[PDB]
């Protein structure tokens, strides 16, 4: 299976939020999922990546409806075109915080997740 | 290779949470530490694995004050010795709902967790 690609395991059924989007609903999404990161957008372009426990940093509470996804608050971490080889790349992916790496075409737009689970069940089959 | 066991990538700095205590303490640990799940223990006895998106099923936000983590809230999944051999348990491991599996000894003593992120790490070295 040398030549298979990202696109193989894409997922777009994973939370995604925009930037300047509700971080209550953010919050409320990931923590409702099982999810502790998920991709944040500027349009369709990936931006990065936002984490639970940051939106969760600091406060007693949940965020509420005034507080607003910043730009501030991702993790501008790499991501992947859809026709990259996976077999070239498993190092940096299991070394990525996010337990999913975002996909994004050579525009940057963003063309879904692809998880540690997915790759894992993946391999096993074949190793 | 082909012999290593689970004990290799055993990782104890990972929460755990014990039978009949905070619920919201827990769900408020889990959220902060970047996980999804984690083990729960009756004494040193591994019972189950709790997730975070359980324990906030049909709250607001967090658990009540008086809530207490009970065993109807446990996923009771397997566990793996510290012994047994990793490459004949992938398939399993890559199915677990929870991204990493908990490991027990004969005696149903907790001896830590593995997760998806360092057996990934692992086989990427390798293939």
Redesign the interface.
């Given at each position: 299976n040398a030549s298979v690609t990202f696109s193989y395991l894409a997922e777009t059924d994973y939370p995604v939020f925009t930037l300047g989007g509700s971080t209550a609903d953010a919050a409320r999404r990931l923590?409702?999922?099982?999810?502790?990161?998920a991709p944040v957008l500027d349009g369709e372009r990936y931006l990065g990546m936002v984490?639970?426990?940051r939106l969760?940093?600091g406060r007693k509470?949940?965020p509420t409806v005034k507080e607003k996804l910043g730009e501030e608050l991702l993790e501008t971490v790499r991501s992947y075109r859809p026709g990259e080889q996976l077999?070239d790349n498993?190092?940096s992916?299991?070394?990525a915080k996010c337990?999913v790496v975002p996909l994004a075409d050579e525009d940057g737009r963003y063309e879904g997740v692809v998880s540690?689970?997915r790759?894992?069940?993946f391999?096993?089959?074949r190793?």
């Open positions: 923590a409702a999922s099982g999810c502790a990161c984490h639970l426990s969760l940093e509470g949940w077999f498993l190092i992916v299991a070394a337990s540690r689970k790759i894992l069940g391999l096993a089959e190793i």
